[PDB]
Amino acid sequence: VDLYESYSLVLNKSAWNYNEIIQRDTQLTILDMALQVHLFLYEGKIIDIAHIQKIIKTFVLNVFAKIIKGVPIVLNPIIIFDSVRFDKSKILPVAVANPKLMPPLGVQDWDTIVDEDEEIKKIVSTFIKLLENALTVGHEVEFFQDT
Amino acid sequence: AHIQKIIKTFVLNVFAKIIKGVPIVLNPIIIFDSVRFDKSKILPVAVANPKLMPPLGVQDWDTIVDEDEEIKKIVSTFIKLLENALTVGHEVEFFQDTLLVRNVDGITSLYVSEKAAQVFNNSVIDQIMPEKPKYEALEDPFS
Amino acid sequence: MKNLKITAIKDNLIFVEGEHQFSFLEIIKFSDKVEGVVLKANDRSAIVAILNEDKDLNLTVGSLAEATGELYKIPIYDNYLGSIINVLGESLVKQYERTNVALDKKYVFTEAQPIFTRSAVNEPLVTGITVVDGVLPVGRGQKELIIGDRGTGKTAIALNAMLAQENTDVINIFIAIGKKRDEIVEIYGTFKKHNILHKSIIVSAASDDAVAARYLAPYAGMAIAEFFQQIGKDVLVVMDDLTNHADAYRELSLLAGIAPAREAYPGDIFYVHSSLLERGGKYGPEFGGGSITILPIAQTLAGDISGYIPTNLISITDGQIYTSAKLFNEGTRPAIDVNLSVSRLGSAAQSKFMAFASSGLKKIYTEYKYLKRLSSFSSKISNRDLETLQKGKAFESLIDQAEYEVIDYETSAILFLLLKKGFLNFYTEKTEALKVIIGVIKVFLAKDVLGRKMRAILVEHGIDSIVWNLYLNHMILPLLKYHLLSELQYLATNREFIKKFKDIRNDGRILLAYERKGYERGIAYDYK
Ligand SMILES: Nc1ncnc2c1ncn2[C@@H]1O[C@H](COP(=O)(O)OP(=O)(O)OP(=O)(O)O)[C@@H](O)[C@H]1O
Ligand SMILES: [Mg+2]
């Protein structure tokens, strides 16, 4: 079989890449995105930065809980969060290529898994926009814990 | 000799790109990757395109080729001829002292000599990169 | 019907005979296309300067002509925009088809509107050049001369100023007097490439065209600009160049028999240029309510700014921009000599944030040159002189800018603010590092959504607001601190460095990310 067909080889490669990026110390944590959101939203109402960090972490944990149940989540036409499971029930979160022409089946918007409050939706939308911009310019953003 | 130097430069760029964990796609059929078991132990492989788990950070060959039209045309022709030779059933050499074969169906394999694996391990342990290819005049095949 | 007959052709002038009531610049029609203008006239004879030529006409003695009885008026057509035309309105190179119905007819020598029709200049004209937009401001309705030596980049400055109007409402007009055709075609291609062709006109009079055409081209261009201004539009006019226009007028006058004067130019060359250039400015709503901004170009000899024509033009325009051949020889582009340039409108032709950002930098630069050229006995330099020298050297590194590069107004304002607050002085030992950091800051402000947000909030809330201070303190200053620590480690202990970069985190991930992005198209072994 091929190096992709097994959990151990892919995990080793992913861990090596993550460790290298961590040891470079050039990645943007959740605090950085919270501060960017606070600065971008600092002209409609001031939102506490710690509040934004807590909200972002709860949202990403909601995404984690949804992806561990085998339901892909689409955050943007560009980024779609999915999961790939190998033998022995092992699973691994992934971001797919070409999300434009081969979209995963039964995709749901993020708006479904977010509280209906206007503030929470605005905060998460701003976070998503900043994440897209940071990825475009060439940053390395952390989404789940230790990823 | 110019074309040979250009091809060697392209394969060395692929070699340098795959030891850093970056797979290189030359065509929808052949994708060059690396498998590392531990520090100081890596091995180049050729794999098909996976169906449900897209590879991590795949780059086209076009990324690692100069933008000049002549260079791009030479490398494109080399890739096309390599694909045809693999399809018909040849055994083409890609790196120095290695061999690229296409087995039954669409499964491709890369067989590594002793010294090729030695140079791979030297590159990964001591960062001793192979020297840049140079223009070598053609040598008479006989005598 | 024909009522005149040609009797002589001397000195490139046509002498016609026939009873008529001639007038100055009355159009004489020799065929359906070839026309001339009456210069002097008796009650039965006239002297005419031709405007164009035809291959098949064979205009000689005895040819018949008609005195149309009307003045030289240029007609306006819908397809002028995005085309090159001559002085009579013929499309040499056109982009769209023409409907043969004239929108208007504008007199070539229309007198300038009187004093009560004007208005004060209060709106900037973004030229896309940092040093021009910040220290030598150009407003809407202001005449700024571009004076310089041969091959120093004046045409490039005018072209940059017009290309900066890609996302505005300002109509560009380029009048070319005695230029090369292969350069006019290249400028046309440049206009087509940058998507400003649909709002740009070119009026062309080649170096070997008729002398009357070269003399009357700027007036025809000004008539077109006046037509556009009468419907309340901002017009930016670039005349390239008035040295050729003065030469054409001198040639016409000397061949017509007029006596010479200083430098062999006729005695009324100043009146020519002043009555030409007094037709641009800002106008009140009751009289069109638009503006005509003019950027004439003129050439000196060996950097002699005290020449007759350069000083005649300086006394007409509202300041000047001087391009130095010494600076150009050193690879400094644009080769603008700020110490020899000036804008007479000043901070009144700038935005509030731009005016505050560069309040006293030009005077500081003049003082920096004066101290640099001064020789003294005490080799001890006071703190004020050290600050002046450092700030002048830092200012010298903001001038450099690539060809055809348009820098946003807010980016220039932010850079001038950074210079004014004293953050760029620490680069007094390394200038390449300063260039790199300026490039990184410009890229960040142009591409990132946070940079555009910073520029937008700078425009709407001003510099003094809390939000912009937070943006500056959390986005730009950390990058400068990180870069200064990286390039110059000893600054970690400097007193002033500690004083300014006190509550600033040493964050430099933007520069590293951009460096990674640039180097990601990198190869271990080169092919060449
Ligand atoms: N900012 C710039 N960066 C780099 N090159 C530039 C810049 N501005 C102008 N140049 C180049 O410098 C040369 C001279 O400029 P340009 O032709 O505009 O000057 P000029 O004063 O109009 O000259 P001429 O006397 O020939 O009319 C040209 O090759 C032009 O492309
Ligand atoms: Mg020129």
Note down, in words, how this protein is organized.
The structure is cut from a larger assembly and holds two copies of chain A and one copy of chain C (528 residues). Chain A is built from four helices and four strands; from the N terminus they run αααββββα. In chain A, strands 3-2-1-4 form a four-stranded mixed β-sheet. The two termini of chain A are 27 Å apart. Chain A is α+β, with helices and mostly antiparallel strands. In chain A, α2 packs across α3 (49-67). Chain A has helices spanning 7-24, 30-40, 49-67, 118-137, and strands at 73-74, 80-85, 91-95, 108-109. Chain C contains 17 helices and 18 strands. With 528 residues, chain C is of the alpha/beta class. In chain C, the strands form four sheets. Chain C has a six-stranded antiparallel beta barrel with strand order 1-2-5-4-3-6. In chain C, strands 9-8-13-12-14-15 form a six-stranded mixed β-sheet, sandwiched between helices. In chain C, strands 16-11-17-18 form a four-stranded mixed β-sheet, sandwiched between helices. The longest helix of chain C is centred in the C-terminal third of the chain and has 22 residues, at 466-487. In chain C, 37% of the residues lie in helices and 17% in strands. The interface between A and C is medium-sized, with 15 and 19 residues. The complex binds adenosine-5'-triphosphate and magnesium ion (MG). Adenosine-5'-triphosphate is lined by residues 148, 150-156, 333-334, 401-403 of chain C. Chain A: This is Expressed protein. Chain A: It comes from Mycoplasma mobile (strain ATCC 43663 / 163K / NCTC 11711).
